[PDB]
PDB file of C-alpha atoms and ligand atoms in Angstrom:
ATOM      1  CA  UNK A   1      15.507  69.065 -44.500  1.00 24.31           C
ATOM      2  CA  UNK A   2      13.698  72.178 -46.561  1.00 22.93           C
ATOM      3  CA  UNK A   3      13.672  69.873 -49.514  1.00 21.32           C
ATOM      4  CA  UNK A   4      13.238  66.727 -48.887  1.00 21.18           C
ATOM      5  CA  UNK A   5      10.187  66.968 -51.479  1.00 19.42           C
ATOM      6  CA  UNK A   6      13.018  66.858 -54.001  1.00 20.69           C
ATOM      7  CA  UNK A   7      14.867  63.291 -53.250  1.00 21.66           C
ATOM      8  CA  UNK A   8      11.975  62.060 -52.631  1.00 20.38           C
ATOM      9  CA  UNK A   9      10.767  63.049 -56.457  1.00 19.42           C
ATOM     10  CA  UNK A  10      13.757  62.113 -57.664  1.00 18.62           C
ATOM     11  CA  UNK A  11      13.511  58.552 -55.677  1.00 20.23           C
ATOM     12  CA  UNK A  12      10.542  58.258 -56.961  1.00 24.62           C
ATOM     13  CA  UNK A  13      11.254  59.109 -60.249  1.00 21.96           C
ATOM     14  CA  UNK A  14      13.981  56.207 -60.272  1.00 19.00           C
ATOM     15  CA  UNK A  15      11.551  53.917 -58.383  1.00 20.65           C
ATOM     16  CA  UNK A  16       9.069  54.224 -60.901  1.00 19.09           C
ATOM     17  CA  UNK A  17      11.915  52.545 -63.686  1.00 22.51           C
ATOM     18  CA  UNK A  18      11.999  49.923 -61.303  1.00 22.29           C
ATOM     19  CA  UNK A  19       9.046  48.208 -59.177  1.00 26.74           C
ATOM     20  CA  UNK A  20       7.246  45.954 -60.991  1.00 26.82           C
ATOM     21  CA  UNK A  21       3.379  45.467 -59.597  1.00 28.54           C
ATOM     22  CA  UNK A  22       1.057  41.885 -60.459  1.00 25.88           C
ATOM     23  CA  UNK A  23      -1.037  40.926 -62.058  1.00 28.52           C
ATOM     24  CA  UNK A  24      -4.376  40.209 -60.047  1.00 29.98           C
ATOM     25  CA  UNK A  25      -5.871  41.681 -56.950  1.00 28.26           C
ATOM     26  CA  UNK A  26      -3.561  43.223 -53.959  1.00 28.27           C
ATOM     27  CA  UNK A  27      -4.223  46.905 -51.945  1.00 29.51           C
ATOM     28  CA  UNK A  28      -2.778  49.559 -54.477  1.00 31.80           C
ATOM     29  CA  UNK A  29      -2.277  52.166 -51.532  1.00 33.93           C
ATOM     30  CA  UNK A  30      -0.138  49.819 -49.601  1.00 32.97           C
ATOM     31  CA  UNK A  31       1.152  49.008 -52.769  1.00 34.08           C
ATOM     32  CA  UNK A  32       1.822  52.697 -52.622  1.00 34.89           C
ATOM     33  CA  UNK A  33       3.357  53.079 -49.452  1.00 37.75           C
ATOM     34  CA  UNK A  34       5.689  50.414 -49.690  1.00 37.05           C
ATOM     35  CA  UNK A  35       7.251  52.309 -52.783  1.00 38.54           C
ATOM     36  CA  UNK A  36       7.000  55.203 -50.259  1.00 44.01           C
ATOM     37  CA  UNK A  37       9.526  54.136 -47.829  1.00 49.19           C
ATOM     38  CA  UNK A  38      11.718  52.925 -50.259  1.00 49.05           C
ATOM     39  CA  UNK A  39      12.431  56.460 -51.561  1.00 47.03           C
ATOM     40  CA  UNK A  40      13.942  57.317 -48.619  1.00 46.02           C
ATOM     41  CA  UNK A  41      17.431  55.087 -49.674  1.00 47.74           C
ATOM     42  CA  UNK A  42      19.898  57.421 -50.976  1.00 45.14           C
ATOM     43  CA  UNK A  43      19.084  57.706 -54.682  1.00 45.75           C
ATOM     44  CA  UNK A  44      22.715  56.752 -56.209  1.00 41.55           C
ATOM     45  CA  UNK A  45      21.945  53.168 -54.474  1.00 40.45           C
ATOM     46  CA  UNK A  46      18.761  52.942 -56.036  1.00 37.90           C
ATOM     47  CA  UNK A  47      20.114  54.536 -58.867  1.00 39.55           C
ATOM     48  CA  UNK A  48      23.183  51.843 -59.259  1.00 38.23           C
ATOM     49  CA  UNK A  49      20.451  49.206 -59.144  1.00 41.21           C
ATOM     50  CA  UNK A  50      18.343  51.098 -62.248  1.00 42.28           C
ATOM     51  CA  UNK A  51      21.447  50.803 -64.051  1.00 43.58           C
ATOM     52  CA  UNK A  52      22.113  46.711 -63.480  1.00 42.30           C
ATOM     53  CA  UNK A  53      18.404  46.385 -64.514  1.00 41.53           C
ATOM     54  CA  UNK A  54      17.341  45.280 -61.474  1.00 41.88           C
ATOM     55  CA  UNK A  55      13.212  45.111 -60.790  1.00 39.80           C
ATOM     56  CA  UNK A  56      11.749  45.012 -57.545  1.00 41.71           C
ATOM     57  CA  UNK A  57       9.184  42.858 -57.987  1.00 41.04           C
ATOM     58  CA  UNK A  58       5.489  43.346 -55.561  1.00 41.69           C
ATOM     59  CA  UNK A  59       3.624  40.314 -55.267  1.00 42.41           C
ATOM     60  CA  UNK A  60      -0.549  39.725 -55.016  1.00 42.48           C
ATOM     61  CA  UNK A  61       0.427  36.339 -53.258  1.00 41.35           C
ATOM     62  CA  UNK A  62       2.685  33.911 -51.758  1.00 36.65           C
ATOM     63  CA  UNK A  63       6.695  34.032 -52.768  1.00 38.89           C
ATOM     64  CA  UNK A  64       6.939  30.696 -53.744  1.00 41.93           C
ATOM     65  CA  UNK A  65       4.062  30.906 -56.098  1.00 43.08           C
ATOM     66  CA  UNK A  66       5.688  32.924 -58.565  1.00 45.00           C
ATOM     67  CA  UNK A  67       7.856  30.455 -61.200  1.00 43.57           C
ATOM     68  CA  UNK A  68      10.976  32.076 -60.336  1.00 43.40           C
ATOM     69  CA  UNK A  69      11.005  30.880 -56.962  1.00 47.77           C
ATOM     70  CA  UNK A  70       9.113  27.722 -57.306  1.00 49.18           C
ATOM     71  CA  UNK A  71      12.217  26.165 -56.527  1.00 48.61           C
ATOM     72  CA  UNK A  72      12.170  27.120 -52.981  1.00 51.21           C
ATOM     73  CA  UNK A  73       8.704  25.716 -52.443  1.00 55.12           C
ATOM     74  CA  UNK A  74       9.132  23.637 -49.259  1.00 55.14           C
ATOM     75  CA  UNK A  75      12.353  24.910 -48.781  1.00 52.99           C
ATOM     76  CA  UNK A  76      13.654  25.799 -44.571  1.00 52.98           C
ATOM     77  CA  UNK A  77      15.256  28.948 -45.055  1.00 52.31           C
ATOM     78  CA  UNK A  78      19.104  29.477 -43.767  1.00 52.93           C
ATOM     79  CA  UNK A  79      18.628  29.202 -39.907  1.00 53.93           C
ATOM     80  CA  UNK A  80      15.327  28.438 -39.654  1.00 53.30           C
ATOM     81  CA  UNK A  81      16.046  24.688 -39.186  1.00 53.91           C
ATOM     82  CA  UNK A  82      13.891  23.681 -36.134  1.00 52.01           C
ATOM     83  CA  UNK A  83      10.911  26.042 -36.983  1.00 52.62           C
ATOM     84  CA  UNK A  84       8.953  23.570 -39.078  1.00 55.59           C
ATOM     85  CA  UNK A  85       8.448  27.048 -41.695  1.00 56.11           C
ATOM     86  CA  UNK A  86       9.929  27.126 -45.060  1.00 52.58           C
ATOM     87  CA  UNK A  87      10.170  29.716 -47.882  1.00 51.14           C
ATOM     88  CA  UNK A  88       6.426  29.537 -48.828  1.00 49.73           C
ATOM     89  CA  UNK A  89       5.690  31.013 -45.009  1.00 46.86           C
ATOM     90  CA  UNK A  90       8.315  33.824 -45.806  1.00 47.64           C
ATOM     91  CA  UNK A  91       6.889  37.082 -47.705  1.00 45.79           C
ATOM     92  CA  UNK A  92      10.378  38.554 -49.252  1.00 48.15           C
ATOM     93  CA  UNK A  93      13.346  37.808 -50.497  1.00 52.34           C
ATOM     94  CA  UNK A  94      16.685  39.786 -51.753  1.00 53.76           C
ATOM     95  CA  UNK A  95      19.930  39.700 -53.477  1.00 51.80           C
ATOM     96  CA  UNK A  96      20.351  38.809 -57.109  1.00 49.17           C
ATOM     97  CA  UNK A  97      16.618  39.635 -57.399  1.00 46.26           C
ATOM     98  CA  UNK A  98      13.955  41.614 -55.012  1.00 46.08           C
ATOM     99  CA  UNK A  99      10.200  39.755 -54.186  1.00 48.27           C
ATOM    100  CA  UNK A 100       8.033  41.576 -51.412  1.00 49.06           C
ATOM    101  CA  UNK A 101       4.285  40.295 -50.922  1.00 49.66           C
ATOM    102  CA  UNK A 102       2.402  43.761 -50.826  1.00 50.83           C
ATOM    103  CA  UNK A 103       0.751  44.031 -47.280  1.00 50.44           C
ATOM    104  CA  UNK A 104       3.931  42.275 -45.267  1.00 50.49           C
ATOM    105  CA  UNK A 105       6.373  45.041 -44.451  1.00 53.95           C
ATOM    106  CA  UNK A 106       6.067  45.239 -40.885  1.00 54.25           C
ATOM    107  CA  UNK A 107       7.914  43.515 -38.259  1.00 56.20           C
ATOM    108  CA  UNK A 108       6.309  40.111 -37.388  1.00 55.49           C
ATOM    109  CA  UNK A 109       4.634  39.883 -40.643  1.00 56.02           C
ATOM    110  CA  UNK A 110       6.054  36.245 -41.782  1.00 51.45           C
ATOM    111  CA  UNK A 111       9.476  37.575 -41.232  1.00 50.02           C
ATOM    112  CA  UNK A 112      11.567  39.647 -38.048  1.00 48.52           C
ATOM    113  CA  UNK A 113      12.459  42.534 -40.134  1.00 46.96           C
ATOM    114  CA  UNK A 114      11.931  46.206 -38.902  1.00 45.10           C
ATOM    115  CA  UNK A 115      10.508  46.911 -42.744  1.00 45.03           C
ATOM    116  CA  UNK A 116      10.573  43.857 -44.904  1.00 46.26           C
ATOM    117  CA  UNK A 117      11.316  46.332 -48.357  1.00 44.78           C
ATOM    118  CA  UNK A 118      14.326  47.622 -46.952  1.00 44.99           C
ATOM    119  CA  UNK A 119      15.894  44.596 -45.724  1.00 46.12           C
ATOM    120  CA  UNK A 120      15.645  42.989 -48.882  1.00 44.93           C
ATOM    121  CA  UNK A 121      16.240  45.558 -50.881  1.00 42.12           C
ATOM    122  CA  UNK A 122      19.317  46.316 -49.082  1.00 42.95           C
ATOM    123  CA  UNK A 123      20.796  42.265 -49.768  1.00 42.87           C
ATOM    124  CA  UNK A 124      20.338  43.759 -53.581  1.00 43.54           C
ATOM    125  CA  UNK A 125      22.271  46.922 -52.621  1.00 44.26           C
ATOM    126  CA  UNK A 126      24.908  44.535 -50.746  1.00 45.24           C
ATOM    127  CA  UNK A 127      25.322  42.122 -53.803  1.00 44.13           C
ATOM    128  CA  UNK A 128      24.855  44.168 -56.713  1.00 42.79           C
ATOM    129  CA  UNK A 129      26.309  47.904 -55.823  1.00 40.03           C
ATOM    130  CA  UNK A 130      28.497  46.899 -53.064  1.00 43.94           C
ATOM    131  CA  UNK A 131      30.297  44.157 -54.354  1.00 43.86           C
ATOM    132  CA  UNK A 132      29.380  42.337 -51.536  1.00 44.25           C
ATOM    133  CA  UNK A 133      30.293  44.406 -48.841  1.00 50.55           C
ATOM    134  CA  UNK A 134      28.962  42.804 -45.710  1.00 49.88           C
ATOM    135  CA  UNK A 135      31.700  40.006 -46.414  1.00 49.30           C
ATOM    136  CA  UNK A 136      34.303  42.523 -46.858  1.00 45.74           C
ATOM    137  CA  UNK A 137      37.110  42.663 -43.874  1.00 44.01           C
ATOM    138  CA  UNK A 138      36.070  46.384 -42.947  1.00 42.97           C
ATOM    139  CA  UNK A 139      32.290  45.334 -42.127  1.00 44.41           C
ATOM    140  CA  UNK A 140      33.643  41.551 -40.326  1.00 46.34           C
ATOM    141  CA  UNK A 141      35.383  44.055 -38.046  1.00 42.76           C
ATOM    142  CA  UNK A 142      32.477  46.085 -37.680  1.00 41.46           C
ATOM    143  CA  UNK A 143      30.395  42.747 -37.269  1.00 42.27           C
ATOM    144  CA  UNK A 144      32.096  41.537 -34.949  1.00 42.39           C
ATOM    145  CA  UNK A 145      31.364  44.342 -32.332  1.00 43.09           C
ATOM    146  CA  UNK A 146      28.561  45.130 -33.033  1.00 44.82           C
ATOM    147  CA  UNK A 147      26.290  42.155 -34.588  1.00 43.56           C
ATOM    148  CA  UNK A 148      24.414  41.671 -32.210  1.00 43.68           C
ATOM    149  CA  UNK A 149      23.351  45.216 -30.961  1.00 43.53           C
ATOM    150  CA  UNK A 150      19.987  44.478 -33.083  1.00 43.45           C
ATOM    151  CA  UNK A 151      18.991  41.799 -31.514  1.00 43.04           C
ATOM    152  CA  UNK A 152      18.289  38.418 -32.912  1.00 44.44           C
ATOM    153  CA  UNK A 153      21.519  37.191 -31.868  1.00 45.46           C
ATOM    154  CA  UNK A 154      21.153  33.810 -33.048  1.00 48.12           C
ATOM    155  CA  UNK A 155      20.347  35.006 -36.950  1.00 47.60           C
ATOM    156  CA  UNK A 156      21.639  38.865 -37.142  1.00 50.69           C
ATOM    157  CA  UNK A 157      24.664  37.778 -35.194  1.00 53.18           C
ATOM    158  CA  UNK A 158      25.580  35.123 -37.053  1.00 57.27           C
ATOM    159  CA  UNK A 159      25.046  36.089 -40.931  1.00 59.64           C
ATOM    160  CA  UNK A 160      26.901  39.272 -41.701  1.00 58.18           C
ATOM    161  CA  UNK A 161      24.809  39.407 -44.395  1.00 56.30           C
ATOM    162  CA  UNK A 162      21.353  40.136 -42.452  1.00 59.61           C
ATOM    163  CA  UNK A 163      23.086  42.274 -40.067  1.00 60.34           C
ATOM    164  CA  UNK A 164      24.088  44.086 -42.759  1.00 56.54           C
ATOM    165  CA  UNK A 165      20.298  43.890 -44.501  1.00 54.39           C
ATOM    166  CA  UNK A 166      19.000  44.936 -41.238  1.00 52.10           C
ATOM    167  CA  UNK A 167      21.049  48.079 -40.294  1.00 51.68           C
ATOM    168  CA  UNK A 168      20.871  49.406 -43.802  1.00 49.38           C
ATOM    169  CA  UNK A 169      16.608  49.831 -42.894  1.00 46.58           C
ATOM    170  CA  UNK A 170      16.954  51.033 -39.955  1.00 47.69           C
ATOM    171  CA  UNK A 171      19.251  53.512 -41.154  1.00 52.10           C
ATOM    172  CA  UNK A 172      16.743  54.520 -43.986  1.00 52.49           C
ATOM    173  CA  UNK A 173      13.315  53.216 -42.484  1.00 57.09           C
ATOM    174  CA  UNK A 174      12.680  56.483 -40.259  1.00 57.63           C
ATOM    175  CA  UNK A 175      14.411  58.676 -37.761  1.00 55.69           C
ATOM    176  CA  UNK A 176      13.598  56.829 -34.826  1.00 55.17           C
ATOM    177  CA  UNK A 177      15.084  53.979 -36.193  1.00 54.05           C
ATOM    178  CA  UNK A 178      18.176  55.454 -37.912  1.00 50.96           C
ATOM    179  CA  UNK A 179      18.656  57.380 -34.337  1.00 52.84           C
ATOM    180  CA  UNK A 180      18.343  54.045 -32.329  1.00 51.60           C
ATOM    181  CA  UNK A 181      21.288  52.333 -35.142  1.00 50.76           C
ATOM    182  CA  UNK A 182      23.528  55.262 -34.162  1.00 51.06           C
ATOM    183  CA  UNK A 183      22.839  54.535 -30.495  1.00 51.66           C
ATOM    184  CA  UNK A 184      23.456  50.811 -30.689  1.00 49.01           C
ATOM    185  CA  UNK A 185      25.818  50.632 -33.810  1.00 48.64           C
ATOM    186  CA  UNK A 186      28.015  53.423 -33.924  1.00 49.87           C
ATOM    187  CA  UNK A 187      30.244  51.940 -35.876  1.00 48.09           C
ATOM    188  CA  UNK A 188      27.879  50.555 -38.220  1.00 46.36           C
ATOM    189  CA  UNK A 189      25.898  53.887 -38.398  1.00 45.31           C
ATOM    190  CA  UNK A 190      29.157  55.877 -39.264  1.00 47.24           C
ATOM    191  CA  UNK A 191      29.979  53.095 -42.293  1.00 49.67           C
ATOM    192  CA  UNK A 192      26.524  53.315 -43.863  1.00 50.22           C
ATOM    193  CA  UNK A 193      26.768  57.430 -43.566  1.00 52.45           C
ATOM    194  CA  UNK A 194      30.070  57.221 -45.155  1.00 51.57           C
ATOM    195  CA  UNK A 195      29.131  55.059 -48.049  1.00 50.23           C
ATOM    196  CA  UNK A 196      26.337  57.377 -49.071  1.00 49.00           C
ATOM    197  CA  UNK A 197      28.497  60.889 -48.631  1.00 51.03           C
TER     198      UNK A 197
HETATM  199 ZN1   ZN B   1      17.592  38.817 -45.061  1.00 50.78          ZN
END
């Protein structure tokens, strides 16, 4: 913990070959921060995604008003049926690809996410690095125990996926969050540690 100025250079350093920022207006300090908190993933994760040319991309405006994702305009996201919200309400998106609308990483901000970057950057790290993991047999055990320790029973629960999304930031948000995984999660806490040793 005497050099944590170091990873975070070097996450930096690797960040900086990856986020994309827009065209047009948005807040360049949140901008900032959000690139911030990502630095705190262990760097051969981000450093796996460098490689497969992955770009996180920060938006000035709404998801589905980027061409790329112009196909989800009006779009009801995987269990949200009942809601009456579809993908142009939601700021973020992960897995092949990363979208974040600059100003929406907190919880409750279009999306139920402790920190919207890491979530979705962690469906990236699931797909791309990990071959998938949170579908593996090793993490439906683990999912099965403890999926709904979280909360959001109904969506975390349910998807392996977002459970898996959703641990992976609070493991790498802060350390009240990575200490309240190992609390609820053991078993989750002690697979993402041992991934990244
Ligand atoms: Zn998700």
């Amino acid at each position: 913990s005497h050099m944590d100025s170091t990873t975070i250079q070097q996450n930096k350093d690797t960040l900086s070959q990856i986020v994309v920022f827009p065209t047009g207006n948005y807040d360049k300090n949140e901008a900032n921060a959000m690139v911030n908190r990502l630095a705190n993933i262990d760097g051969k994760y981000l450093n796996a995604l460098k490689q497969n040319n992955l770009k996180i991309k920060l938006l000035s405006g709404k998801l589905t008003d980027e061409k790329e994702y112009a196909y989800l305009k009006g779009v009801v996201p995987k269990g949200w049926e009942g809601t009456g919200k579809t993908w142009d309400d939601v700021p973020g998106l992960g897995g092949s690809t990363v979208a974040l609308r600059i100003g929406f990483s907190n919880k409750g901000k279009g999306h139920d996410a402790i920190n919207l970057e890491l979530h979705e950057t962690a469906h990236a790290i699931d797909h791309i690095v990990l071959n998938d993991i949170s579908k593996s047999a090793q993490f439906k055990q683990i999912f099965a125990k403890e999926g709904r320790s979280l909360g959001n029973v109904n969506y975390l629960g349910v998807y392996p996926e977002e459970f898996f999304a959703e641990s992976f930031a609070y493991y790498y948000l802060n350390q009240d969050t990575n200490s309240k995984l190992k609390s609820a999660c053991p078993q989750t806490y002690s697979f993402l540690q041992n991934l990244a040793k």
